[PDB]
Amino acid sequence: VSKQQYADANAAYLQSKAAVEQARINLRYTKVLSPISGRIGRSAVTEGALVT
Amino acid sequence: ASVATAYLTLKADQAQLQLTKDTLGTYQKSFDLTQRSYDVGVASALDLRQAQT
């Protein structure tokens, strides 16, 4: 194959590897992690509540 | 009639030789452009081999 075809295939592979990381970010957002370390209060919402 | 036939045959085949000599130069220029396109990296060896054939 030519070098331009390999450059095109590498560009498409890297764009897909970035899109799957964009998906992993939102998948990591559904497990909402504690941003800092400290004492946590009470939960203002319970199980079954809809958030936005 | 035989002398006239052989003379016209030679007259035709010299023009055939000149026209094939032009076609060979056309193919040579096309191979040079394909070799340049392969040496810069846009074509592959599969096109270079066809232009060689």
UniProtKB/Swiss-Prot annotation, chain B:
Q: What induces it?
A: By growth under severe iron limitation.
Its localization reads: Cell outer membrane
The record lists its disulfide bonds as none
- Phenotype when the gene is knocked out: Disruption of MexA, MexB and OprM significantly reduces active efflux of N-(3-oxododecanoyl) homoserine lactone/3-oxo-C12-HSL/PAI-1, but not N-butyryl homoserine lactone/C4-HSL/PAI-2.
Which domain of life does the UniProt lineage start with? Bacteria
Please state which protein family the record places this protein in.
Answer: Belongs to the outer membrane factor (OMF) (TC 1.B.17) family.
Q: What does this protein do?
A: The outer membrane component of the MexAB-OprM efflux system that confers multidrug resistance. Functions as the major efflux pump for n-hexane and p-xylene efflux. Has been shown in one study to be involved in the active efflux of the autoinducer N-(3-oxododecanoyl) homoserine lactone, thereby playing an indirect role in quorum-sensing; but has been shown in another study not to be involved in efflux of this autoinducer. Over-expression of the pump increases antibiotic and solvent efflux capacities.
Question: Subunit structure, briefly?
Answer: Component of the MexAB-OprM multidrug efflux complex, composed of six MexA subunits forming a hexameric tube, binding to a MexB trimer, which interact with the trimeric OprM outer membrane channel protein. The OprM homotrimer forms a 135 Angstroms-long pore. It consists of a beta-barrel, which is probably inserted in the outer membrane, and an alpha-barrel formed by alpha-helices which probably spans the periplasm. In the ground state the periplasmic end is closed, while the outer membrane end opening is 6-8 Angstroms in diameter.
Instruction: From the Swiss-Prot or TrEMBL record, give the protein name.
Output: Outer membrane protein OprM
